[PDB]
Design a protein around this nucleic acid. Structure first.
Length: 65
DNA sequence: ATTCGAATAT
DNA sequence: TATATTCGAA
């Protein structure tokens, strides 16, 4: 059946621990490299997708204003 | 080909 | 609102 990139995973709930992991990666990344693919790799979460990160990073950037 | 990201959808 | 998906741009 589906697998890897095509797996139809449930909605990602950003727990406080997951979010803190995200922030610690983004905060210490070169601003040039603070993009969803790089964030996704550095966060080291089996099953996290680049799209999960992009949507979360969008709101985060509004929060940082 | 790839992937970003604001806009939009659910 | 939080998270997902679209789609034009880089």
């Amino acid at each position: 059946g589906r697998q890897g990139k095509t797996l139809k995973r449930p909605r990602l709930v950003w727990t406080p621990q997951l979010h803190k992991r995200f922030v610690d990666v983004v905060a210490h990344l070169g601003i040039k490299n603070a993009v969803p693919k790089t964030i996704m790799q550095l966060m080291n979460v089996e099953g996290l997708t680049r799209e999960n990160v992009a949507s979360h990073l969008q709101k985060y950037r509004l929060y940082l204003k």
